[PDB]
Amino acid sequence: IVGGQECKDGECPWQALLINEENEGFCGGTILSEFYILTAAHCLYQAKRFKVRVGDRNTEQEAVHEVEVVIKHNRFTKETYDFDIAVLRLKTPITFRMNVAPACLPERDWAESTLMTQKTGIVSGFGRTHEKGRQSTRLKMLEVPYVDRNSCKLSSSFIITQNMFCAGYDTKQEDACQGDSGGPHVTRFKDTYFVTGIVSWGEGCARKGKYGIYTKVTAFLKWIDRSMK
């Protein structure tokens, strides 16, 4: 996360971190329930074996869960990042506590008419804090304005499918960045946070005239429901 603020105690409890063999974070995830994590399909190629960490806001000062089943969308394309979504079923259930809680999955039509129409959502992760930099040791979050679909396609050098949406700032230098992929984009409605996107891709980080591109969760609610059964 470039710009934004540190997640304070209890503010981003649905954040998950995918960590490699060397226990270094390489992507985020969102906690959906005691057994399931939502992430980006493209993250699954950034490590051969990985585990999921929850509850840590600081990777330097200390729960780790192994993955049982990886459910990847059969239509994910490396070429366009379309269908950039996966669900992980963990071997052991997550114990909810301070800094560890699931985000809500919304009902589809209501999400589209009420959440996707809000002014902003919130992205979070342990990704880089500058386009060139190391992964963050602290969990960060950033309020990102929803971006008009037409404005977004006009700003992009790559195709924006209906499975994606744009969020961020045109000029202000704040964005998700490398290492944040697969993480939560949530939208608050009356003090309840609903999962609305998955961090997916961007042309650099915080580049003028570019926005962050996210997997549109509403396009996959039935898919997610099915995967969790």
């Binding site: 409890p13 009902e107 309840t192 946070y193």
Partner: protein
Amino acid sequence: RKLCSLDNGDCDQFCHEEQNSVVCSCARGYTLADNGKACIPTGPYPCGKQTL
């Protein structure tokens, strides 16, 4: 603005219109309150709540 378009039909969470009337509902782990509008957590750590 009418029904669900008017302040989310006064619903805490999900609002649907059935037969030109508001019907509120809630995410898993919440129960719809007696007023048919509020959503009450069934346990600690309900979804979507910061742990403050």
